[PDB]
Amino acid sequence: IGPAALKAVYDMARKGARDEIQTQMRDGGLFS
Amino acid sequence: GGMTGVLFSLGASMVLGGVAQMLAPKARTPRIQTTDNGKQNTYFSSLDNMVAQGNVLPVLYGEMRVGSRVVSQEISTADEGDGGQVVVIG
Amino acid sequence: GMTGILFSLGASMVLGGVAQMLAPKARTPRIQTTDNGKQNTYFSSLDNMVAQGNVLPVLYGEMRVGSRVVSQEISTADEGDGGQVVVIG
Amino acid sequence: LWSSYTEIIDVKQCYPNTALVGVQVDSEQFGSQQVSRNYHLRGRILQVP
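Structure tokens for the assembled complex are given below, as produced in the milestone run.
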């Protein structure tokens, strides 16, 4: 089904972005 | 819609910043200047007169002698006079 | 073929403000504690600076303002601006 | 002899809810520079139970 897949991808692209934000600001990244 | 897939538990994802941070929200240190040398001023002390132009009026909560914000400064000639009639200038 | 996922974004832009959708808004400078409580202007420099780091500035009208000093030098003056009127005593 | 007399009116503008201190000093024994005023005051009246 469509909307279930869309909501799943949207919620999956949340913690990925959050982890990317957190790792890129730690020591030698771009500081978000 | 009956089920809620992708539970997506958050454990160390918030611990990674520190453990005391999730019990106490930490404090904000001021910015360090160079012309100030090494006097690390905080956000709750002021021992000098400030200027009250388009600024906020500070508040005080207990003890801790503070400066102020100057609103009017003026010099005039000191006239001779006391609380009475004794006005000897000899 | 088809071009799906348009994903209209009219709602997201307003989240930062609506007046910004027509005006980029003027930038504001930061506040230095050392410079008491004075507010720095972004388009005027009353103080006369030093000709080095500061880039050659530009003027656009009025504004009695300072400068960037290139050479300062103090010596001994002459007694008499010119002509034959050169009295001393 | 009589000399010029001056009629002076003070500030009628009162400050509604701001604490303030006015200080007048002869400022002769002080140096040519300004003088810093520091005051050792208590806190604010709170709504304590």
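The CA atoms of residues 80 and 90 of chain B lie 12 Å apart. The interface with chain C takes residues 33, 35-36, 41, 50-55, 69 of chain B (CB under 8 Å). Further analysis is deferred to the final report.
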